[PDB]
Design a protein that fits this description.
The structure is cut from a larger assembly and holds chains A, B, C and D.
Chain A (H helix, E strand, L loop, with lengths): L12 H8 L7 H13 L8 H10 L6 H15 L2 H5 L1
Helix pairs in contact in A: 2-4, 3-4
Chain B lengths: L8 H10 L9 H8 L6 H11 L2 H11 L10 H12 L26 H14 L9 H18 L2 H8 L12 H5 L9 H9 L11 H17 L4 H4 L1 H8 L1 H12 L20 H11 L2 H4 L6 H16 L8 H16 L2 H10 L19
Helix pairs in contact in B: 3-5, 11-14, 13-14, 15-18, 17-19
Chain D lengths: L9 H5 L4 H17 L3 H16 L6 H8 L3 H10 L4 H19 L24 H21 L1
The chains are: A mainly alpha, B mainly alpha, C mainly alpha, D mainly alpha.
Chain lengths: 87, 371, 222, 150
């Protein structure tokens, strides 16, 4: 919802770390929510290689909602981040 | 199937998915001919039949397609990826952990019968003989790509034995030597397949499962030779694997020739315990146990000449012929290699012309000139 | 007829303005004549402990200009230690270009160079591109010398398969790209790989192509 | 994928006065070791081998049979997953075998599996429980040998 108030964040590294620290769990719904959150943040972190690797790994996962969340995050990170597009 | 409707064809495809829920519902022969024939909407209809047909109908289609029939009523180009999609249906793997199998042996497999697998391998080897513009390396790449499903559909030693014992005849577009040599991926220990591969003498870079054990044994032997209980399999298992499976040793010879390169550093050859007499004698015995492999085809000179130069450097840097049995064994091996083939001498003369000016004694002039 | 020296007595005699000309004549005579290198490489290596910022770079240059038909078994420690004594910001790239174009006799020198490059990385992460390029060149020069060292570089276990290293670690990506570059002409490279090595190669190859080459792994396609 | 956490209560499931709970714990640990390979899994497998070896001398024949009939494939999978345990398992097996060697000779039988020592395995009904346990031990040893050799 609050997308325009996203670029005015001072501490970005700690925020991204706290967001990404929950994608390593074994819960597919949690991983899907984390992927959707990362895709929602595709306007402030278009070069974080960890997010690209997570989206690449979880794109062909054995699930149904996690795959859709990975597709959404991949579209968001492919809008920007030419490197993610070519990858 | 008859009219060449260019733009409207897709419209007809709609009528194939609107008033026809199951593909094989009214007539099986016409649908099988439309799906698998001797066009453009083929992959879409294949995906529809894969993700919209019931399991009994799918098994029936699989058993009627992969059956023994020489009427060419099924395209193997579509049959291969159809089977690959039926094995990897996303409904079969719903929510389990992603990519955590056992690489030693796959448990979840698709069981098949005898004649079914026979017809499958027959059509696979038959369609891989066209080679319109692929060449030769692309055929091997396709074989390597389709080998996983071929090993997954059998999952048994009896099926592998039945597969390796079937060798067709002919001399044009054989393409069987590659499949017979691909047994190294399944860690096959059959002597018939090894004999067939040795008779074919086909050099292949296929990824083998038993190559890791051979590499580990070679590394352990090298470490034991460089350090001096680990010496048990260092000299007894290596030669056993060499006399049993010579292809693995021939393919591992690249990394073996790069070892024992400590002769240039220590030129004394009198103070070394085993780093200059054990590994050299071991590799000399390994080469002696492979007389039929030293005079083999090409793609092995890069290792043969390397081993020859290493032996020459070890003999020249010796403490004035500190070893008697090793020199005699090396001379006998060189004589046998020169008598078995003429390319070995033509390739080693460039080093012999310089090695004959170092000793200049009655020992190097042996081959340079009971019961 | 020659009854003089000026080769082993002209180096440690006076100021370095003549040492530079001496090593220049040395590399000039070694470039033309293919011989004479095996007996002058020792002298060219042992002249590094000269505590002069000029003779060091000139030694790097004369070794790079003669990096052909030469061997290196134990003379590497006297030529690699030029990066620990000081910063040498403008000499480090030359040393890395030298270490990649040369040949190594055994795997011990390869392991020494690798651990030294890892030390330089963990101590100076500001020149990782030069390290990756030199490792690429080293892997493309002689890929066989690293074959008996594959299970020793990366931490792997025959029956555990645990202790997964960090992805963005600048210490493991170097070894990964070195293995991938040495995996070109190796007969059976993936026979000793781990489980995550295949996905690491799949991610690095699709992200960058100037350092990771194309392979024929059974897991990948095309 | 959330089955590894069961390891954290596998030892607690072993220390139970019911033989069925112990058998189920041994089988679950066997499957977890053949699926997951971790040092903690190796430690729990070693503890299971120890508690199975110490239960051979505190159980009667009627309970020994029922406890060692299902739990031998567990040892087979432990050998398949953990090489360094081989010796231990072998020793354990030997012990159990010798125990059976004293149980068959006690009471007269109908098949006399003692003279069957000089027999080979043939690829691939109602009998005596001790003879059945002997045959199960022999079969599991054969499978362990075939897995380790191939």
């Amino acid at each position: 919802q609050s997308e325009k108030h996203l670029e005015k964040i001072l501490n970005v590294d700690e925020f991204v770390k706290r967001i990404f620290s929950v994608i390593h769990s074994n819960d597919p719904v949690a991983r899907a929510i984390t992927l959707r959150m990362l895709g929602s943040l595709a306007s402030i972190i278009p070069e974080r290689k960890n997010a690209h690797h997570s989206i690449r790994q979880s794109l062909d996962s054995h699930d149904n909602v996690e795959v859709e969340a990975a597709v959404f995050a991949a579209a968001n990170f492919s809008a920007q981040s030419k490197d993610f597009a070519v990858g | 199937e008859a009219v060449r409707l260019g733009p409207s064809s897709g419209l007809l495809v709609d009528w194939l998915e609107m008033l026809d829920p199951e593909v094989v519902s009214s007539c099986p022969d016409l649908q099988l001919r439309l799906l698998f024939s001797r066009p453009s909407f083929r992959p879409y209809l294949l995906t529809l039949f894969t993700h919209q047909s019931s399991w009994p109908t799918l098994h029936q289609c699989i058993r009627v397609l992969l059956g023994k029939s020489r009427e060419q009523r099924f395209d193997p180009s579509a049959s291969l990826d159809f089977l690959w999609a039926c094995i990897h249906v996303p409904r079969i793997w719903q929510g389990r952990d992603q990519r955590t199998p056992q690489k030693r042996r796959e448990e979840l497999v698709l069981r098949v019968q005898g004649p079914e697998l026979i017809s499958l391998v027959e059509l696979i080897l038959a369609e891989a003989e066209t080679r319109s513009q692929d060449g030769d390396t692309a055929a091997c790449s396709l074989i390597q790509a389709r080998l996983p499903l071929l090993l997954s559909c059998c999952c048994g030693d009896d099926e592998s034995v039945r597969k390796v014992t079937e060798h067709l005849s002919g001399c044009i577009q054989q393409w069987g030597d590659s499949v017979l040599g691909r047994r190294c991926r399944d860690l096959l220990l059959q002597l018939y397949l090894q004999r067939p591969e040795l008779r074919v003498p086909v050099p292949e870079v296929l990824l083998h499962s038993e190559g890791a054990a051979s590499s580990s044994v070679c590394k352990l032997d090298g470490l034991i030779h460089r350090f001096i209980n680990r010496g048990a399999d260092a000299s007894m298992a290596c030669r056993k694997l060499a006399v049993a499976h010579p292809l693995l040793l021939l393919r591992h010879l690249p990394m073996i020739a790069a070892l024992l390169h400590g002769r240039t550093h220590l030129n004394f050859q009198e103070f070394r315990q085993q780093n200059h007499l054990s590994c050299f004698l071991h590799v000399l015995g390994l080469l002696e146990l492979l007389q039929p492999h030293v005079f083999r085809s090409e793609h092995q000179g890069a290792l043969w000449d390397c081993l020859l130069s290493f032996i020459r450097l070890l003999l020249n840097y010796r403490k004035s012929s500190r070893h008697l049995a090793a020199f005699i064994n090396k001379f006998v091996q060189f004589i046998h290699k020169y008598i078995t083939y003429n390319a070995p001498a033509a390739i080693s003369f460039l080093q012999k012309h310089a090695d004959p000016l170092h000793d200049l004694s009655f020992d190097n002039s042996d081959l340079v000139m009971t019961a | 007829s020659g009854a003089c020296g000026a080769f082993v007595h002209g180096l440690e005699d006076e100021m370095y303005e003549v040492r530079i000309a001496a090593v220049e004549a040395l590399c000039m005579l070694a470039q033309s004549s293919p011989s004479f290198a095996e007996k002058c490489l020792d002298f060219l290596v042992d002249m590094f402990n000269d505590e002069i910022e000029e003779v060091r770079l000139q030694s790097i240059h004369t070794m790079r200009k003669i990096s052909n038909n030469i061997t290196l078994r134990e003379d590497q420690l006297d030529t690699v230690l030029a990066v620990l004594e000081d910063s040498s910001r403008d000499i480090r790239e030359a040393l890395h270009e030298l270490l990649c174009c040369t040949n190594v006799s055994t795997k011990e020198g390869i392991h020494l160079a690798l651990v030294e490059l890892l030390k330089n990385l963990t101590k100076y992460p500001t020149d990782r591109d030069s390290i990756w390029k030199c490792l690429k060149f080293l892997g493309s020069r002689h890929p066989t010398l690293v074959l008996p060292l594959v299970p020793e570089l990366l931490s792997t276990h025959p029956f555990f398969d645990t202790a997964e290293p960090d992805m963005d670690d600048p210490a493991y990506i170097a070894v990964l790209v070195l293995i991938f570059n040495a995996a070109k002409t190796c007969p059976t490279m993936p026979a000793l790989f781990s489980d995550h090595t295949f996905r690491h190669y799949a991610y690095l190859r699709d992200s960058l192509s100037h350092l990771v080459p194309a392979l024929r792994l059974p897991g990948r396609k095309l | 994928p959330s089955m590894h956490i069961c390891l954290d209560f596998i030892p607690e499931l072993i220390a139970q006065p019911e033989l069925e709970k112990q058998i189920f714990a041994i089988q679950l640990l066997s499957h977890l070791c053949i699926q997951y390979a971790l040092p903690k899994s190796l430690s729990v497998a070693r503890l299971a081998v120890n508690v199975m070896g110490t239960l051979l001398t505190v159980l009667t024949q009627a309970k020994r049979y029922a406890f060692f009939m299902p739990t031998l494939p567990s040892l087979v999978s432990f050998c398949r997953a953990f090489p360094p345990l081989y010796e231990d398992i072998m020793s354990l097996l030997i012990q159990i075998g010798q125990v059976c060697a004293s149980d068959v000779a006690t009471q007269t039988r109908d098949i006399d599996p003692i003279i069957t020592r000089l027999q080979q395995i043939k690829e691939k009904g109602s009998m005596d429980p001790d003879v059945q346990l002997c045959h199960c031990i022999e079969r599991t040893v054969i499978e362990i040998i075939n897995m380790s050799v191939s």
